[PDB]
Amino acid sequence: SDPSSINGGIVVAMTGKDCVAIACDLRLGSQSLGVSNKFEKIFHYGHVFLGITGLATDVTTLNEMFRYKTNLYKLKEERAIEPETFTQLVSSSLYERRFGPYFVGPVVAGINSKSGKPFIAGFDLIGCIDEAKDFIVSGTASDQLFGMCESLYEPNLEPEDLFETISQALLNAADRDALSGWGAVVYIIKKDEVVKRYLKMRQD
Amino acid sequence: TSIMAVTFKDGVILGADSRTTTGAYIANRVTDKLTRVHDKIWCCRSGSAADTQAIADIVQYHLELYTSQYGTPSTETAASVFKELCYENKDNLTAGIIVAGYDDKNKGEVYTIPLGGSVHKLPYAIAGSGSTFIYGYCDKNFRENMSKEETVDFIKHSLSQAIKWDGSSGGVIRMVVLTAAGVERLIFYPDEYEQL
Amino acid sequence: TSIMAVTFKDGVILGADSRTTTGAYIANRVTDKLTRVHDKIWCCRSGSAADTQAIADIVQYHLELYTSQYGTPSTETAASVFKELCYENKDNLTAGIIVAGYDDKNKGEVYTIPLGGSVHKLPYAIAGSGSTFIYGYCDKNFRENMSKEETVDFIKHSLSQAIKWDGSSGGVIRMVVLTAAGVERLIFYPDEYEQL
Amino acid sequence: TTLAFRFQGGIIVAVDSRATAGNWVASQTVKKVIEINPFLLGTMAGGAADCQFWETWLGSQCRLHELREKERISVAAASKILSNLVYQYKGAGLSMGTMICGYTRKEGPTIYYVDSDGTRLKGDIFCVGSGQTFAYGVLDSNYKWDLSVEDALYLGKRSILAAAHRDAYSGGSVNLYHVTEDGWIYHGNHDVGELFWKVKEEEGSFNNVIG
Amino acid sequence: TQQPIVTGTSVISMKYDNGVIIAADNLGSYGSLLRFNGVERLIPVGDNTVVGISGDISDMQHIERLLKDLVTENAYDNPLADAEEALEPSYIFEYLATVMYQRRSKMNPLWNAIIVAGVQSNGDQFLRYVNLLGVTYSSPTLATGFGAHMANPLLRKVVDRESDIPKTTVQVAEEAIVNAMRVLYYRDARSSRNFSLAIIDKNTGLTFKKNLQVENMKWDFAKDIKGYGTQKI
Amino acid sequence: TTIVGVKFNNGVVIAADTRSTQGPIVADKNCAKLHRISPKIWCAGAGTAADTEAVTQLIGSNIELHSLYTSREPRVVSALQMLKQHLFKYQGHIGAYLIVAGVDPTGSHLFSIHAHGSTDVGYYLSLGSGSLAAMAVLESHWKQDLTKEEAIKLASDAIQAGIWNDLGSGSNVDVCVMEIGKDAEYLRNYLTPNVREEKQKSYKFPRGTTAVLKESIVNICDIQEE
Amino acid sequence: QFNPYGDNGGTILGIAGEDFAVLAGDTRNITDYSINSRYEPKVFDCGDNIVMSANGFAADGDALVKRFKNSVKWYHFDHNDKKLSINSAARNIQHLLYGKRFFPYYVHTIIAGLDEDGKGAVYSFDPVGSYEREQCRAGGAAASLIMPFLDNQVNFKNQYEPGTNGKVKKPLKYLSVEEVIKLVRDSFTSATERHIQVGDGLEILIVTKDGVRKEFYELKRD
Amino acid sequence: MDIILGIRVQDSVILASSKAVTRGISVLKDSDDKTRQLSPHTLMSFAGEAGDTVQFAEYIQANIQLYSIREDYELSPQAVSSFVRQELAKSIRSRRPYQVNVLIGGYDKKKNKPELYQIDYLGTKVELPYGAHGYSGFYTFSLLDHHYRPDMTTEEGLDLLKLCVQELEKRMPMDFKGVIVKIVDKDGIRQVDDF
Amino acid sequence: MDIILGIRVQDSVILASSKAVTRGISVLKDSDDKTRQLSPHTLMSFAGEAGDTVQFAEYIQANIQLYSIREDYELSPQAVSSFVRQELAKSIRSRRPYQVNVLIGGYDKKKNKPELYQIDYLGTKVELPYGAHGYSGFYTFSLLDHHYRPDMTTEEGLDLLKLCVQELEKRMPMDFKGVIVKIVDKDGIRQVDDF
Numbered sequence A: 001s002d003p004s005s006i007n008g009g010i011v012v013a014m015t016g017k018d019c020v021a022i023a024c025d026l027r028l029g030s031q032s033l034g035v036s037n038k039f040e041k042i043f044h045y046g047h048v049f050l051g052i053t054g055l056a057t058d059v060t061t062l063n064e065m066f067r068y069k070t071n072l073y074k075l076k077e078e079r080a081i082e083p084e085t086f087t088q089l090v091s092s093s094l095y096e097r098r099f100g101p102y103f104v105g106p107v108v109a110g111i112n113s114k115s116g117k118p119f120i121a122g123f124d125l126i127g128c129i130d131e132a133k134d135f136i137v138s139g140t141a142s143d144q145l146f147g148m149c150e151s152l153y154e155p156n157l158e159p160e161d162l163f164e165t166i167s168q169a170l171l172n173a174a175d176r177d178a179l180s181g182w183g184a185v186v187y188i189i190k191k192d193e194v195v196k197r198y199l200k201m202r203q204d
Numbered sequence B, C: 001t002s003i004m005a006v007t008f009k010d011g012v013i014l015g016a017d018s019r020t021t022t023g024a025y026i027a028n029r030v031t032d033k034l035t036r037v038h039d040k041i042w043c044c045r046s047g048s049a050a051d052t053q054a055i056a057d058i059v060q061y062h063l064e065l066y067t068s069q070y071g072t073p074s075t076e077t078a079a080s081v082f083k084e085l086c087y088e089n090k091d092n093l094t095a096g097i098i099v100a101g102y103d104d105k106n107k108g109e110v111y112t113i114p115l116g117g118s119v120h121k122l123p124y125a126i127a128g129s130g131s132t133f134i135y136g137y138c139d140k141n142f143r144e145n146m147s148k149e150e151t152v153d154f155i156k157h158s159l160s161q162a163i164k165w166d167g168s169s170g171g172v173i174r175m176v177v178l179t180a181a182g183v184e185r186l187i188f189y190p191d192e193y194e195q196l
Numbered sequence D: 001t002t003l004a005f006r007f008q009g010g011i012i013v014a015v016d017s018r019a020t021a022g023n024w025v026a027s028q029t030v031k032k033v034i035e036i037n038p039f040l041l042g043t044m045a046g047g048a049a050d051c052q053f054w055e056t057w058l059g060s061q062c063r064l065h066e067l068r069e070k071e072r073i074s075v076a077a078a079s080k081i082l083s084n085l086v087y088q089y090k091g092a093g094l095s096m097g098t099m100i101c102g103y104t105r106k107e108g109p110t111i112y113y114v115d116s117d118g119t120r121l122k123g124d125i126f127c128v129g130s131g132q133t134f135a136y137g138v139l140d141s142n143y144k145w146d147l148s149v150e151d152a153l154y155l156g157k158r159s160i161l162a163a164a165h166r167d168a169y170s171g172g173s174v175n176l177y178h179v180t181e182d183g184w185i186y187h188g189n190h191d192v193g194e195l196f197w198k199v200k201e202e203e204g205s206f207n208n209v210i211g
Numbered sequence E: 001t002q003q004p005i006v007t008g009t010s011v012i013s014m015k016y017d018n019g020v021i022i023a024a025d026n027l028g029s030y031g032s033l034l035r036f037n038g039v040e041r042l043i044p045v046g047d048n049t050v051v052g053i054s055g056d057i058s059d060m061q062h063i064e065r066l067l068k069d070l071v072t073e074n075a076y077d078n079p080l081a082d083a084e085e086a087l088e089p090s091y092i093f094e095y096l097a098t099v100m101y102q103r104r105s106k107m108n109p110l111w112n113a114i115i116v117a118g119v120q121s122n123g124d125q126f127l128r129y130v131n132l133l134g135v136t137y138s139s140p141t142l143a144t145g146f147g148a149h150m151a152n153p154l155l156r157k158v159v160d161r162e163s164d165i166p167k168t169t170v171q172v173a174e175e176a177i178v179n180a181m182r183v184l185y186y187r188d189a190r191s192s193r194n195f196s197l198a199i200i201d202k203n204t205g206l207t208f209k210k211n212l213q214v215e216n217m218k219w220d221f222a223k224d225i226k227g228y229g230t231q232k233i
Numbered sequence F: 001t002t003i004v005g006v007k008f009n010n011g012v013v014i015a016a017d018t019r020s021t022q023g024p025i026v027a028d029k030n031c032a033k034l035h036r037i038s039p040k041i042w043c044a045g046a047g048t049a050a051d052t053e054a055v056t057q058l059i060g061s062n063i064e065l066h067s068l069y070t071s072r073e074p075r076v077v078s079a080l081q082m083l084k085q086h087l088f089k090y091q092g093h094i095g096a097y098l099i100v101a102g103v104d105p106t107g108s109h110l111f112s113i114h115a116h117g118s119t120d121v122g123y124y125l126s127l128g129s130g131s132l133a134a135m136a137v138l139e140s141h142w143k144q145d146l147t148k149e150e151a152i153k154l155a156s157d158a159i160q161a162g163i164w165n166d167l168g169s170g171s172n173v174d175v176c177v178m179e180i181g182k183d184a185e186y187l188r189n190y191l192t193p194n195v196r197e198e199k200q201k202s203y204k205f206p207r208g209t210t211a212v213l214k215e216s217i218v219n220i221c222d223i224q225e226e
Numbered sequence G: 001q002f003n004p005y006g007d008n009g010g011t012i013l014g015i016a017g018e019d020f021a022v023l024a025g026d027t028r029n030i031t032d033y034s035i036n037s038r039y040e041p042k043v044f045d046c047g048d049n050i051v052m053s054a055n056g057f058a059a060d061g062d063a064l065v066k067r068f069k070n071s072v073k074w075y076h077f078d079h080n081d082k083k084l085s086i087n088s089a090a091r092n093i094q095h096l097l098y099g100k101r102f103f104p105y106y107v108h109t110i111i112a113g114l115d116e117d118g119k120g121a122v123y124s125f126d127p128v129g130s131y132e133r134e135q136c137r138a139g140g141a142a143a144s145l146i147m148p149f150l151d152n153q154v155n156f157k158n159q160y161e162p163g164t165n166g167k168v169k170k171p172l173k174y175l176s177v178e179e180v181i182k183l184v185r186d187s188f189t190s191a192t193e194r195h196i197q198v199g200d201g202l203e204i205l206i207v208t209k210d211g212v213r214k215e216f217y218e219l220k221r222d
Numbered sequence H, I: 001m002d003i004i005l006g007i008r009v010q011d012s013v014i015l016a017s018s019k020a021v022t023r024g025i026s027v028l029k030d031s032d033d034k035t036r037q038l039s040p041h042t043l044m045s046f047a048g049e050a051g052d053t054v055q056f057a058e059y060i061q062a063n064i065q066l067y068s069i070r071e072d073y074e075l076s077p078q079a080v081s082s083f084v085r086q087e088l089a090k091s092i093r094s095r096r097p098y099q100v101n102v103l104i105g106g107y108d109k110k111k112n113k114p115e116l117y118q119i120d121y122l123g124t125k126v127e128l129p130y131g132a133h134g135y136s137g138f139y140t141f142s143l144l145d146h147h148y149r150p151d152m153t154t155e156e157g158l159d160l161l162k163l164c165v166q167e168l169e170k171r172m173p174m175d176f177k178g179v180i181v182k183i184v185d186k187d188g189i190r191q192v193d194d195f
């Protein structure tokens, strides 16, 4: 009945040295019933990555909406939208539904193509921006993720160390949440390569 | 309801209006709200009529039995018996009682027992729905050690105003004077007090 | 809140306490509840602060536009504009407003607009949660055609008592005097009025 | 998820290991088979305390019975002591759904489903919990009276695995028991994480899942 | 279950180098009506303890009688009633805490928050809180009701931790307490100007001050405040 | 949240803590609660954080357009009037509680505004869950004719009282000083009294610790020529 | 309507080592957004080498600890000063808790000590007295922040040997008491950062065959 | 209505849908076909609130038939399922939402692949090898998880389905009066007429 | 539980009672016997709230068996049904009433007559040629009203019962898993073992 925990799922993002990572579980359920183990929650529009947790219908709607808007942005601006700019657009878009909101917890990650600066941000369902230097968490196991990230995280991790840190933060958070898991993906993002990794994890 | 009791030089005086209502209907316009629990210990009752009558009947019984065994009870003792009933049965009572009495040692005394069954000894006390409207008037006009005539005037003017503004108060103003000399009953009609 | 307005020989005086509470917390202890809607038409506000500020701002706008087109509005006209807003939006407002003003034709006038948006022209008026406690005092002590000093005293003593008994009233007593001579602001501090 | 079934070799009892408070996984190491005595097993579903408390109390009543009568209590009598007790409390908010399992000389292998609203049912296959419907599917389509002990144990394990996979509130590990006339025998704790991959590979099941 | 009718507001207190201080105003409110103006809410027990009580006044008067009856009873068959077998602050507290928790457990609480302040036989400061739920706790400063929100922040600037206690004189502590009482008078709508203050010192015993008033009040700045935004006159 | 405003000699100062929470969890440890309405009109917000940001941005936008239209520097009373009329119309559903301070050609100003649209005037104000702790400090130490240095001191002490005593507040003090005839100076993390101590252990993992099923390169580049 | 319950915050943590056990708790006591005390001890030595914490509603927690201490006293009186073993203490506490099944002690109880072979032991209870022996258990406000970290760093969950890519688990080595205490301090340091009810102080009781020792550490006070 | 299942095998999609229609106390009908053909190679089954199910299904059917005529072209199963999802996502924030859950089984003639989409009344869409709505999945998924292979023939799909329906008839309290089974493949849509 | 029917023919009473036991979402059992023999020529079937049904039935059985031993005598069906009615009438004003409805089919050896009593949980008793509890009567009474004759044989009673059960299996939404049928006559109580 609480719309933000009908389907379950989590997203976490972290900054490292000249890189960012964003990861998510793959579960979609209807409360206790596991429905799909291939429901990816991270999307990208050019070099800007967006993870969305919460009500799955809204996750899909918002992805389609932001693809729509970033496509038009690109045709008119003649350049790809940047993480800072896209973050404002997500916030604007969510707040326009102030009194009938999308039941989601979005997370933005990417590197500004001009400055090279790593960027992450999180939002409540109504567009309030949390722009963290270290990490952002979202979903039905967000308490668990805060616990994992707060002790596992250290600044300036090299991409390959950041991968282990974020993977372990996700995996162990998810295993303490009934509604998260059933697979996981980790994106490691640098200024001109992105690598995507599917993790092996318990399937209960 | 508008009720008060006021200590003065020679003792204490109790006053009350005479209106009891069921909603907006005046079920009785000549009620006697000044109730005797001992010869020179009286009380004014507010809240549930059923409750305050039950309580006063029980207190009267207690003080009758106290008198048989130990002689005349003090006003404080009477207040304590009231309080015991009001405090211990607070969940099942709606009663706000002012206790007034005359001793020869202690002279005039006034105790108020509000809703929760706490007790408060005071130079004078006001209660009932009508009392809200005369907190300012009474506080400005009360003096200690007034004469009998002054105290009658103070109460008469006070309850005049309570009756004027409170729809649940009205009728006659009744008073009972408690002094060394005895027990005197007074009554004042609308045509007197409305012109004050 | 304790607010009042009193007509006297040379015009009208408005008075108010300065306390606004959120539950038991005093959110502001130096509030100005005497609000100007025209040069010599003021009002005292009680009820929802949001509502009464919104209403007064709208009335001020209306009387500014009225003045531009038709010259100085009467106090009655100001009361009528207040009433129109309070009456037509009664479902969505909690506002009890006293309107006071000085004309040279009409001199001092007082109108009270209680909760339902009715209007009542009166020699003086009291409102706010604190007013309940001074109905008796004010009714006994008000006279028509008092002097300025007497009217200041009447209001000061009245609001003194309202503040004494009402937890939602307190702080300083503010007044605004409206006469042919101009607009005078007065303030009285606790150490003065508490000793009255 | 908890299950018990009767077969030629006695009774198989299989349970998962997970306890949750809302979505929070409180424990993955819960012991859901309560060892009433060396011959009797009960399963935990509903309230953890109500099951623990009253089924170890049941063990005490069973022990007193056999001291007084110099004979093993029947599963019929043991299960009825529990059901009569919880029935006394009916309406007060006990929560219990349990299988009382034993194997006596007079009865053979016997299972009673006992429940906090006073139900007491004898039967061959029971499955209780949020994952029960998943377990039943595997049980119903593979069950025979003539399973070997080895195949019966696997079937019980495989049925809990099915539940653990699909039911969000089931998982952690599988506990297995085999109840014989001479007492129950524990057949170990099996982490679902490792068990799932092992079964997927050896069986070729769960093709929907990438490994 | 009931509801409080006539009520007392904050009780505030702190430890200092040689003892404890406790204070509470003299008002008994009846909702928003400031009904009763000479109510004593600090109740001394012997010469080493002061029990300060907020919340329902009828229940306060009951507790006060329990304490008086405790003193009577402790003296029974007790030759050392005014010496080694006098009531300690810690005995008085434990008793009250037992009563409060039992009453909540019968779904019939005494609707109060209580601070027991005193000095033990060995000179140790005692300060501990108990309320209608039976919840108890200790801290170098304690306050009930509004006092918890406004007094504690101020009192904690004087004694912020255990090691600050021996550095805090009775003059500094009393002045801190008196300032907190002024602040509560400014900001608590159910407070009064009149209060009582008690010091329990291991050398000078119990000093009980009645009829104190809040003074040195700042109101002058109010004359400059006009309207609620745009008004100039 | 703890937020305060304090008038002084030649100006006004506002301050805030830097903790935002979701129930009992700290979402952000270094939140920015001091918002710019215009160069010399700043506000601090308590309540629903999206609303305090949104209402501040909207009125800030309209204030900037008003400024261009009238060729005049924005006034605090305009921000106040536009804020309160917007909030009033939404009947408290926009959960913005604000302290609005600034300097303009007319002088220096300090107001508070409540979600339903009521406003107030004062020399010292506090809002948020930490406001009773802050107000205790302000009522103890405020006086008429404070200097700039005294007002900054008082404002941050008041925030500190919230930080230490209110569970809803924490981390750092942000300050903004608006003085007549000067640029507004925003002092981000003016105080930093809550740096985390070093951990006992490093939790950096050996590489290859995590089990991986698949890797692939993700194409973030547009469709390629040739 | 009178609500007989409250929430005093607090977070507790018990870990069983090979020949020792620790029970740790923060020393902050709260109601709503206020701090009642920055140092109100919540982990107690109960005698017979048993330590106990009943976290949640502090009135119920204090009542339970007090009753258990008393039960230890009467066990000595009734059974010739026999030492109350940790498993026996645990069963006894189940009966104290279940006795109020229909008006529960609103607490999460943890006890720690050594079993009868000298091995570290921790038992964990729900409010109405279901219990289990455990290696690792956090309770109270920040339990959900702490447990996943412990799963990873005590039990090496989701960690495999580098080079085997998931084929070989990280093997479960035994931790020293110094190691365990590091994990406790980092657990509480992290919880303090992200949970408003956690802070002020950390008190750890350590149980070995030599008895019960204490350690105290400051936590952030915001 | 009640049970709707789907399974995608090697070369086809099979939809099984119960026949009962129950108005509270009486089974009014035992031959109800809970499905609409949207285009020659796309079938949609549905269940949920009375009236809204058939209204929604016929509305979707009319729209896809309109598109087919306008463009002289059959939309892909993916395109149809996206259209249906958007309609339900828009409906969930309506004055009165369609309370309708659907399965879409289509054969994509361009990719030569069967496809099964599961969409609930919120507009939650997922592509699956097999799926269901309501309680049907609770009884059948443990069987499908065990036996399913992506290379099954149509007849093996039907046999696995028989087993699913047998488990439903055993453990489900309600009498759903059997199922109507339809196959979607490269040649279109046909009804298995004994099941 | 759900369906319980009874019919009194020429020389016997026949009780038919469903076999399903349903705990919410799953049919836990499909061979449940919802009946107790109270004495050699008296049978009681029952339905209502879980737990209370069997507790009440075994309590009544224990009491009638006690009476039988004490007096070395079998109470008449009328006497047993009056005892049962009083127990339910007392129970309805209890702290927690037995939520149990019963049929009592007995053969009175003194009058040589079959008798059927219908008693609901309030202690409402009626003697009938045929009866039922719950919704069973709504589907079956129009058939019984038509075909019933007081001189029917046992086999005609069973055939009329088959027809009643067929109508229930057609129009009733719940799957009650068939019925167990028992006959009470001059020789006692027996179970028809194929139905």
Ligand SMILES: [Mg+2]
Residues within 6 Å of the ligand: A174, A175, A176, A177, A178, A179, A180, A181, A182, A204
């Ligand atoms: Mg999980």
Ligand SMILES: [Mg+2]
Residues within 6 Å of the ligand: A203, A204, D163, D164, D165, D166, D167, D168, D169, D170, D171
């Ligand atoms: Mg699972």
Ligand SMILES: [Mg+2]
Residues within 6 Å of the ligand: C162, C163, C164, C165, C166, C167, C168, C169, C170, E034
């Ligand atoms: Mg006042």
Ligand SMILES: [Mg+2]
Residues within 6 Å of the ligand: A027, A034, A178, A179, A180, A181, A182, A203, A204, D165, D166, D167, D168
């Ligand atoms: Mg899952």
Ligand SMILES: [Mg+2]
Residues within 6 Å of the ligand: C048, C092, C093, F091
């Ligand atoms: Mg409104």
Ligand SMILES: [Mg+2]
Residues within 6 Å of the ligand: G191, G192, G193, G194, G195, G196, G197, G198, G199, G222
């Ligand atoms: Mg913290």
Ligand SMILES: [Mg+2]
Residues within 6 Å of the ligand: A035, H118, H119, H120, H124, H125, H126
């Ligand atoms: Mg779906």
